[PDB]
């Protein structure tokens, strides 16, 4: 990009100016929870009275008697996520260097044609 407004919006997109929070709730009610519904969260001791949008569900079978785990505002850190990020960055770097090897070879290849042009012009000038 060349203008300043696009750079400004890009820079605004490039940083996070709020604490990164992730909420997890153990729910044991009768009403089922879907992947789209937005609930109302009220929890006085933790100072919560808001609307929460579901982003992660770990449900059990209806006959399993177990609780449900529901997430909001992205997920906890975890290591396997970090390893996946590192692996995909490694793959991107590998494809980048594979492409740039061919690009450098072409730069060498593109040199010989211009060398020939210089030689032909030198002969013509003589």
């Amino acid at each position: 990009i060349t203008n300043n407004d696009d750079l400004l919006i890009f820079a605004k997109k490039q940083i996070l100016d709020v604490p990164e929070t992730a909420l997890t709730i153990a729910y044991k009610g009768k009403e089922p929870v879907s992947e789209r519904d937005v609930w109302y969260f009220i929890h006085e001791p933790m100072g919560f009275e808001t609307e929460v949008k579901v982003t992660k569900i770990k449900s059990s079978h209806p006959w399993s008697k177990k609780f449900q785990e529901i997430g909001f505002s992205n997920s906890r850190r975890d290591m396997v996520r970090i390893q996946t990020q590192i692996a995909n960055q490694v793959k991107k770097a590998s494809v980048d260097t594979n492409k740039i090897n061919s690009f450098s070879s072409i730069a060498m290849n593109a040199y010989d044609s211009r060398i020939l042009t210089e030689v032909v012009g030198v002969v013509d000038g003589d």
Partner: protein, 50 residues
């Protein structure tokens, strides 16, 4: 007192094996390792995955 002995024997029958789950253990271990990794990254400025 014989039925006390019978119930104690029946209660001795129980297998002393307590099956403990592995998936939750792995997930908690991963979370703690992620906490350690974030700590080490913060102490190194930002010269890490993030």
């Amino acid at each position: 007192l014989a039925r006390v002995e019978n119930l104690l024997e029946r209660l001795l029958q129980k297998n002393p094996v307590i099956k403990m789950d592995d998936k939750v253990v792995a997930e908690v271990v991963s979370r703690n390792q992620a906490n350690s990794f974030d700590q080490y990254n913060y102490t190194m400025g930002g010269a890490a995955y993030s």
